[PDB]
């Protein structure tokens, strides 16, 4: 590579989530399946998150993001590129959310400033027809790292992010991880994981990104003989 996995590891893959052990449906009970027993190879972190696809609506306009519900007080690797706000203002119960500053751009929006967050996914049933899990979040700061999740990430509270994935409480979307050699996804996949668990990660949301790494391989194995 010309520093291609390099770049790609530490750019893209670097800021989101590289893979998480989920169940096998629904969500995760963390006391079904604590932190002290993800035994797995090749991880060097593991965090609670609770994630999914949202839609965002201010009052100028609308968005589509990702939203990372974490655990306020352990680092997450956007830490560092905080604008001037603290991780910690997460609080639960509070709606607070930290918004990539391109996806701040495009809605138009500044600290102080609420927005409607909406999973479409987790929609309720009425008379009138099925409604979105929705909710408003105020929005009190973003994140500024120059890398493509400054357009959609944001960072919320987990179990703020549980109740609108609607999830029953004390419930998370699975544990994190953080891996050492992130583009062996595909092998770390098969490895021995806890009963009733399931392996996603990263190819999930950039199947070309990671066609590219293959592909990339092959042409030096087919060009490069030597």
Same mark, same amino acid.
């Given at each position: ?31 079904? $399946?604590? +932190? ?5 190879? *090749? !991880? @060097? /972190?593991?965090?609670? #998150? ?40 997460l609080e639960p119960g509070k709606?607070?959310?930290? $918004?990539? +500053? ?5 809605? *138009? !929006? @500044? /600290?102080?400033?609420? #927005? ?57 979307? *699975? ?52």
């Amino acid at each position: 590579m010309n520093g291609f996995e390099r770049e790609l590891q530490n750019n893209i893959l670097g800021l989101m989530p590289q893979a998480i052990l989920s169940s096998e449906h629904g969500s995760l009970n963390p006391q079904q $399946l604590p +932190e002290t027993a993800v035994k797995l190879d *090749g !991880v @060097n /972190r593991v965090a609670p #998150i609770t994630t999914g696809d949202v839609v965002l609506q201010s009052a100028r306009s609308v968005a589509v993001g990702v939203m990372l519900g974490i655990d306020p007080a352990q680092k997450d690797p956007l830490t560092p590129y905080l604008v001037n706000v603290k991780q910690t203002d997460l609080e639960p119960g509070k709606y607070n959310v930290i $918004l990539g +500053e391109q996806l701040a751009s495009q809605l *138009g !929006v @500044n /600290r102080g400033d609420q #927005i409607r967050v909406m999973v479409p996914s987790a929609s309720q049933f009425t008379p009138m027809g099925r409604i979105p899990s929705q909710r408003l979040f105020n929005v009190i700061g973003t994140f500024a790292a120059n890398s493509e999740v400054d357009g959609y990430e944001m960072l919320v509270n987990i179990e703020d992010a549980s109740r609108l994935m609607r999830y029953p409480a004390g419930n998370i979307t *699975g544990w994190r991880l953080w891996l050492d050699e992130p583009l062996k996804v595909d092998s770390l996949s098969q490895q021995k994981l806890p009963e009733g668990s399931k392996w996603q990660d990263w190819r999930d949301r950039k199947g070309e990104l990671f066609q590219a790494v293959r592909m990339e391989k092959n042409m030096a194995a087919a060009l490069e003989h030597h």
